[PDB]
Structure formats: C-alpha cells, structure tokens
Amino acid sequence: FVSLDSPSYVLYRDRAEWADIDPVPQNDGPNPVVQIIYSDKFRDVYDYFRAVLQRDERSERAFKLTRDAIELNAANYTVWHFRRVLLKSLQKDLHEEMNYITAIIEEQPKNYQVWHHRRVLVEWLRDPSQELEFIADILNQDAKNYHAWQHRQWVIQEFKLWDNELQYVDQLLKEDVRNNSVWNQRYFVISNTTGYNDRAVLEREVQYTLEMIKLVPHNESAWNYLKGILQDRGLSKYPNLLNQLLDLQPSHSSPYLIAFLVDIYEDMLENQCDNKEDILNKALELCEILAKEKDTIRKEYWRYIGRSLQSKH
Amino acid sequence: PVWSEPLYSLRPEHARERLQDDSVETVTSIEQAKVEEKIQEVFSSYKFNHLVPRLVLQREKHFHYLKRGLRQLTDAYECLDASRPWLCYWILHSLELLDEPIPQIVATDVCQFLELCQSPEGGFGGGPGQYPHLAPTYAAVNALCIIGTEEAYDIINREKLLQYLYSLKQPDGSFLMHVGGEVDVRSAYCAASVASLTNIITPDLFEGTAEWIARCQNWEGGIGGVPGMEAHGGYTFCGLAALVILKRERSLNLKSLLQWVTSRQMRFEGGFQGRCNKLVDGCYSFWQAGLLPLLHRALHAQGDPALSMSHWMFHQQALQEYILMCCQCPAGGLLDKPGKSRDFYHTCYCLSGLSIAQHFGSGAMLHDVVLGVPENALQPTHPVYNIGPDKVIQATTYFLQKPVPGF
Numbered sequence: 110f111v112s113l114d115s116p117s118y119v120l121y122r123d124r125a126e127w128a129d130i131d132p133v134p135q136n137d138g139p140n141p142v143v144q145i146i147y148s149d150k151f152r153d154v155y156d157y158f159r160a161v162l163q164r165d166e167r168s169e170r171a172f173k174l175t176r177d178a179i180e181l182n183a184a185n186y187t188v189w190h191f192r193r194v195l196l197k198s199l200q201k202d203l204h205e206e207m208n209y210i211t212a213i214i215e216e217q218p219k220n221y222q223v224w225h226h227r228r229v230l231v232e233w234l235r236d237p238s239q240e241l242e243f244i245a246d247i248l249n250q251d252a253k254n255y256h257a258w259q260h261r262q263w264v265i266q267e268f269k270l271w272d273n274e275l276q277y278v279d280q281l282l283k284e285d286v287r288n289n290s291v292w293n294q295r296y297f298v299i300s301n302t303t304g305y306n307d308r309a310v311l312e313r314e315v316q317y318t319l320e321m322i323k324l325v326p327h328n329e330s331a332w333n334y335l336k337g338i339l340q341d342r343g344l345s346k347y348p349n350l351l352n353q354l355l356d357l358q359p360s361h362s363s364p365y366l367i368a369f370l371v372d373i374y375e376d377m378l379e380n381q382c383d384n385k386e387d388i389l390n391k392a393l394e395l396c397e398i399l400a401k402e403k404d405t406i407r408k409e410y411w412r413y414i415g416r417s418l419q420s421k422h
Numbered sequence: 423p424v425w426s427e428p429l430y431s432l433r434p435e436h437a438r439e440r441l442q443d444d445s446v447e448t449v450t451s452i453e454q455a456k457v458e459e460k461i462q463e464v465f466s467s468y469k470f471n472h473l474v475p476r477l478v479l480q481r482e483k484h485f486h487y488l489k490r491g492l493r494q495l496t497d498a499y500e501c502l503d504a505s506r507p508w509l510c511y512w513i514l515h516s517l518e519l520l521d522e523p524i525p526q527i528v529a530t531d532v533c534q535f536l537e538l539c540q541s542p543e544g545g546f547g548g549g550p551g552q553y554p555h556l557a558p559t560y561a562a563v564n565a566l567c568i569i570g571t572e573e574a575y576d577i578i579n580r581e582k583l584l585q586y587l588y589s590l591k592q593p594d595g596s597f598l599m600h601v602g603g604e605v606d607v608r609s610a611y612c613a614a615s616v617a618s619l620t621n622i623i624t625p626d627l628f629e630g631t632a633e634w635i636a637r638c639q640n641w642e643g644g645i646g647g648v649p650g651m652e653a654h655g656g657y658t659f660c661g662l663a664a665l666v667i668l669k670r671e672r673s674l675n676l677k678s679l680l681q682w683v684t685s686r687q688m689r690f691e692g693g694f695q696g697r698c699n700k701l702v703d704g705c706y707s708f709w710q711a712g713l714l715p716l717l718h719r720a721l722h723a724q725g726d727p728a729l730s731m732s733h734w735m736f737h738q739q740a741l742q743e744y745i746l747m748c749c750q751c752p753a754g755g756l757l758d759k760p761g762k763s764r765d766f767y768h769t770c771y772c773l774s775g776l777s778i779a780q781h782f783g784s785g786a787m788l789h790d791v792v793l794g795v796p797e798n799a800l801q802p803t804h805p806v807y808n809i810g811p812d813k814v815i816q817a818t819t820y821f822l823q824k825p826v827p828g829f
C-alpha cells in the first residue's frame with residue numbers, strides 16, 4: 110500500500126484501521142543500557158508490531174505491518190518468523206512473496222534472515238525455477254557474496270540442478286580467476302557429480318589448474334585448489350608433479366611453489382621414500398628459505414614445520 | 423634506545439611483500455592493491471627515517487567511546503535493535519580487555535536488561551519481547567559471565583536454556599540458529615559455549631555435532647558455514663572452538679587447518695583476511711588469529727614435540743602493527759581498515775586479537791610480546807569463549823555446583 114518513505118505514509122498511531130488496538134511499548138527497564146534512541150517512525154511501527162505479536166493476531170493488517178518492520182530492520186528475525194506464520198495462516202500467494210523477497214535481497218544481500226526466508230519459500234513451493242538466475246544476478250553485483258553461494262549450493266543439491274554449474278564456474282573464473290568462492294564451487298560441483306576418483310577427471314583438473322597457475326603464478330586460489338584435489342591421496346603419489354614444479358621454480362617461482370614443494374617432501378617422507386636423508390635436507394632448506402626470506406610472515410609456522418620434520422624423520 | 427622501536431612493517435625488505443598481480447588485473451587484485459597502497463601510506467606515517475616512536479594504544483579514547491555506548495546510542499543503531507545483547511558483550515569485553523572497571527550500578531543495570539531479553543521458553547532474544555536466538559544468547563551469557571556476580575549468574579534460567587537448545591537440535595548433529603531459523607556452524611559454537619559455561623551439557627545434546635562440524639571443513643583446510651561451503655575465518659573459529667569444548671578436535675584434519683589459517687595472515691598488511699583472496703580486516707585479528715592458540719592446545723594435547731614454547735604460529739608482531747597503526751579511530755574505537763568507520767564489533771575483536779597477539783601461554787610457559795609502550799598490554803582473553811580466563815574459571819566453577827537441569 111504505502112512505503113515508509115512515501116509522501117503519504119501515515120504513522121500507525123494515526124491510522125483509523127488501527128485505532129482498535131493499543132500499541133505495546135518496549136520495556137527496557139528503569140535504567141536502560143545500550144538504549145537506542147529510535148526515530149518516531151521506527152518506534153511507531155514496532156510498538157504496533159509488539160501489539161500484534163503479543164495478541165498473536167493473524168491478520169492482513171498485521172501482515173502488511175511486518176513489511177514496514179522489515180524495512181526498518183531487515184535483521185529482525187522475530188518479525189520474519191511472524192511474517193512466515195502469517196503467510197501460512199492467511200494462505201498468502203507464495204509467488205507474490207517470492208517477488209517481494211527478490212527485491213528485498215537485491216537491496217540487502219548481506220543478511221542471514223532474507224536468504225533464509227527465500228529458502229523457506231522455495232521449500233514450501235518446491236519450485237527452484239527462479240533460483241539459479243536470481244542468484245546469478247546477485248553474484249553479478251558481488252561475485253563473492255557468501256549467502257548467495259551457500260543458497261546456490263543448497264538449491265543445486267536439493268533439486269539436483271548440476272547440469273550447467275561447471276559452465277557457470279568456468280565463466281566466472283574467466284572474469285576473475287582469483288575468485289576463491291568460484292574455485293570452491295568448482296570442487297563442490299565435481300566432487301558431487303563425477304567425483305575426483307576418475308583419473309581422466311583428475312588429470313583434466315590438474316592440467317586446468319596448472320594452466321591457470323602459469324597464467325597467474327601468484328594467484329593463491331589456484332595453488333590451494335591444486336593441493337586440495339591431491340592432498341587426500343597424498344601429494345607424493347604424483348611423482349610427475351614434483352618434477353614439473355621443480356622445472357618452474359627457477360622461473361615462475363614464488364612462496365606458493367616453494368611451499369608446495371615442502372608439502373610434497375613432507376608427504377614423501379611420510380611414505381618411506383628413497384633417499385630419505387636427501388629429501389629431508391631439501392625440505393629443511395626450503396623451510397629456512399621460507400621463514401627467512403620468501404614467506405617471513407609465516408616464519409613461526411615454517412620453523413614449526415622444520416622441527417616437525419626432524420622429530421618425524 | 424627505549425624511545426625508538428623498529429617495526430617489521432617498516433623494514434626496507436617489507437616493500438617486496440607488495441602484491442604481484444602478474445600483470446593480470448581482475449576485480450580481486452585491483453581491490454587488494456588499493457588497500458595495500460593506503461596501508462603503505464599509513465605505515466610510512468609512523469616512520470621518521472631512523473626514528474620510530476613506540477606505538478600507542480589510545481586506551482582513554484577507546485574507554486570513553488565504550489563507556490558512552492553502554493548507556494545510549496543514536497538511531498544509527500536501529501540496525502542492531504535485534505542484537506542488543508551483542509552490544510552489551512562487545513562493550514563489556516572491550517572494557518574488560520582494557521582493564522577498565524565496571525561500576526556496580528552499570529553492572530546491575532546490564533543484568534536487569536539482559537533479564538528482560540531472556541525468553542520464557544529459554545535463551546535470550548535481541549531485545550525485550552523478541553524470540554530467543556542463539557547469537558544473542560551466546561552474547562548475553564558471555565556478558566553475564568564478564569560481570570561475574572552471583573546476581574549475573576542467577577539471571578540465567580538454566581532449565582529453560584537446556585530445553586531451548588534441545589528445541590534447536592537437528593538429527594544430523596547441527597543446530598538451528600533459532601526456531602524456524604537457518605543452520606550453519608555458528609549455532610554449534612553458540613550452543614556449546616553457553617552449555618559448557620552454564621554446565622547444562624547432557625550426553626545426547628551434542629550427539630553427532632562433532633561429525634557435522636568436521637563435514638564443514640573443506641578442501642582448503644578451513645571450515646565453511648555448512649558442508650560444501652568456502653572456508654571462512656568466522657566459521658572456522660566457531661567450528662574449532664566448538665570442537666575444543668566437546669573435546670573432539672581430532673575429528674578435523676588439524677594439519678590442513680593450520681596451514682590454511684596461517685596462510686590467511688597478509689604478508690603486507692600484517693592483519694588477517696577472512697577467506698582466501700579477500701581483504702584484510704581488523705576483526706579477523708580474533709576470528710583467525712584466535713585459531714592458533716586453539717590449535718596449539720589441540721596439538722599439545724596430542725604430544726606434538728615440535729610445538730613452540732614461546733610463540734603462537736602466526737606473526738604476533740605484524741598483527742599488533744596492523745591493529746595499532748591501521749585499526750584505531752583517533753576519536754576512540756577500533757575498526758576494519760583505514761577509511762572505515764568505528765563500531766563496537768570491530769572494537770571488541772580488534773582488541774581481542776591484540777590481546778591474543780601479546781600473550782602466549784602453554785602449560786607453565788608464559789611469554790609476552792607487548793609492542794609499543796608497556797601500557798599497551800591488555801588483559802588476557804580465553805581463546806574459546808573470548809572473555810577473560812578468570813571469568814571462565816569463575817563461571818564454570820559456579821555453575822558446576824549446580825546440577826544439569828533434570829539431569
């Protein structure tokens with residue numbers, strides 16, 4: 110009907126259709142703390158929200174009131190819960206509510222309540238037809254919105270919409286190969302579809318990642334993904350990777366490559382590798398290089414790794 | 423000389439820690455470079471050639487800002503009308519860290535207010551009359567424990583609190599944040615924190631929880647909000663702290679977690695980012711750096727012979743430099759990064775993180791590294807609960823004398 114900023118907006122205490130119910134003031138006690146000096150409009154809406162809540166009035170007027178309460182503070186989970194109780198009791202059109210939550214999230218995308226409300230609606234409707242496109246629009250504004258990605262994973266997994274997500278991942282990595290949220294989605298998609306046990310898939314992923322690394326040597330996300338898809342089996346289980354990284358050291362070096370070498374040596378020593386002494390010495394030299402020159406911010410960590418290696422091998 | 427203290431961030435070699443974008447620009451590198459340029463300007467403002475004055479924590483300014491916020495706030499805080507117990511906690515904990523006494527009157531007033539926020543169904547809501555929610559419940563309990571008086575302790579309706587937690591427990595081990603609410607690792611931590619402090623943990627309350635949390639650790643080594651999601655310092659702190667309380671840390675791959683969190687400290691800024699390839703932020707001084715004392719304890723419990731007996735596994739000095747030089751608002755209060763406005767949340771976590779960076783403690787070993795003037799030394803904070811260790815002991819001791827509700 111009328112928004113909080115509309116020129117014809119009227120305070121609830123002045124609305125004739127609300128005269129039959131007394132507003133319920135918030136009781137902060139005689140000597141309040143962290144007391145918020147609310148604007149007149151804010152207090153007005155909440156004095157009436159408190160009245161309808163206390164009265165558990167499942168009405169259309171109460172339903173419209175929650176919209177104003179939400180605009181005043183979209184983080185008020187109590188209002189959101191009551192609004193959902195009303196959607197149910199009043200048998201409100203859920204597609205209309207979806208259009209509402211769509212506009213709300215667009216305005217305030219970094220908020221837990223709005224995304225949960227949308228999930229509940231999708232669950233009630235069992236209709237995910239608008240999700241991937243809507244989420245894509247949110248991500249087009251902030252490619253790393255955590256709630257957006259989380260909601261995306263839920264929808265995809267709950268309604269089995271895996272078919273085009275890898276293509277989506279590839280497009281976003283093209284726009285920003287440093288987007289860690291996208292590399293995460295990549296792992297999410299592959300592990301839940303083909304899995305990484307298929308050696309053809311793993312090879313494709315390793316090649317893809319190595320190519321991204323050559324293009325942007327200092328992008329940590331690609332390095333982390335490379336380790337991520339090989340760590341469970343053990344980095345030392347991939348002998349060719351060590352050689353390839355070794356050849357790049359002189360040129361495409363970096364603390365990421367050096368650290369990866371240490372991770373490989375660590376696993377090698379853990380698996381009774383040949384030339385144990387030689388590997389240990391190489392690993393310790395690299396730990397020192399990292400701690401003293403190439404990754405000094407992590408000196409304590411690298412010193413610890415050096416000592417751990419000696420205590421174990 | 424005592425009047426000059428060399429800084430890690432001011433070393434000439436530190437310039438080599440600047441971002442190398444490989445000549446490939448993306449939104450990520452552009453934003454990172456912008457932050458670094460601003461931070462370098464700030465760093466340089468504390469250096470006068472070979473003269474480097476000791477850094478100063480503006481205690482008095484922070485105190486006055488905090489003292490004022492504890493009583494009243496402008497309508498600018500209407501956005502936090504559903505998180506008032508958080509304001510109480512952030513402010514009280516900051517004052518506690520600054521070793522600023524809490525007047526008896528103020529203490530009793532806070533108690534009365536939190537009592538008004540407590541729901542008859544158990545737990546606390548964001549304000550009087552609001553439904554209970556695990557976030558403000560966690561904050562309310564921490565605030566009451568910081569006050570630490572029998573009056574504060576007894577405000578908590580333990581019988582209803584346990585029933586409330588039961589009402590949020592899911593069969594897969596997770597917890598809802600509130601009735602009909604969302605689920606993510608924050609709930610497990612909020613529940614474990616309040617339940618352990620108030621001694622209301624039952625054998626079945628956290629059945630399956632440790633396993634659910636472990637499922638949240640991902641390929642990165644860190645922990646995400648729910649299984650499958652990106653590792654974030656916030657959810658990682660919640661996950662590990664909850665597991666420590668449950669004595670199930672071993673359910674995680676501590677090696678990948680350790681490597682992940684240490685990688686979150688920014689080589690140039692000195693502070694921590696919340697997730698890979700995102701920006702440095704003062705509040706992660708706690709969420710991220712706080713994971714190191716937790717990891718230290720976990721590894722120490724397993725008999726790790728390589729653990730340090732004097733330092734946490736992150737650059738303690740660099741973090742203190744970032745906080746002291748880049749996160750203090752001249753008018754009092756702390757913040758995310760230069761250019762951002764102060765708020766109680768960042769004031770609480772920047773200070774919490776500074777305290778962790780200043781104090782190392784393991785077994786009988788204690789080693790302090792207080793950068794700047796000695797007055798910068800803050801009171802210690804417990805890595806699990808983030809309230810004074812003295813407050814944790816006093817509260818747990820008090821509640822341990824009470825039975826678990828309905829056994």
Ligand SMILES: N#Cc1ccc2cc1Oc1ccc3cccc(c3c1)N1CC[C@@H](NCc3cncn3C2)C1=O
Pocket residue numbers: 505508557608656703705758767
């Ligand atoms: N739960 C949660 C959570 C989600 C996101 C962040 C930090 C978070 O930690 C917390 C914990 C408890 C909180 C209680 C009331 C308001 C909060 C909280 C943020 N927000 C939301 C806006 C915000 N600001 C965001 C912010 C500032 N620094 C990091 N963040 C990210 C801020 O204070």
Ligand SMILES: CC(C)=CCC/C(C)=C/CC/C(C)=C/COP(=O)(O)OP(=O)(O)O
Pocket residue numbers: 219253254255256557560608611612654655656657660695696697700701703709
């Ligand atoms: C007890 C309790 C409630 C703990 C909360 C822990 C915590 C800090 C969680 C953060 C989760 C999150 C959604 C971050 C993304 O925000 P962002 O994108 O704004 O931040 P970013 O850019 O730093 O990742």
Ligand SMILES: OC[C@H]1O[C@@](CO)(O[C@H]2O[C@H](CO)[C@@H](O)[C@H](O)[C@H]2O)[C@@H](O)[C@@H]1O
Pocket residue numbers: 300337338340341636637638639640641642643644673674675678679
């Ligand atoms: O950090 C990796 C570490 O996490 C565990 C859970 O403790 O598994 C996570 O990471 C795997 C990829 O390495 C995923 O397959 C799994 O789904 C995710 O939970 C450990 O098994 C692993 O060592």
Ligand SMILES: [Zn+2]
Pocket residue numbers: 703704705706758768
């Ligand atoms: Zn922050």
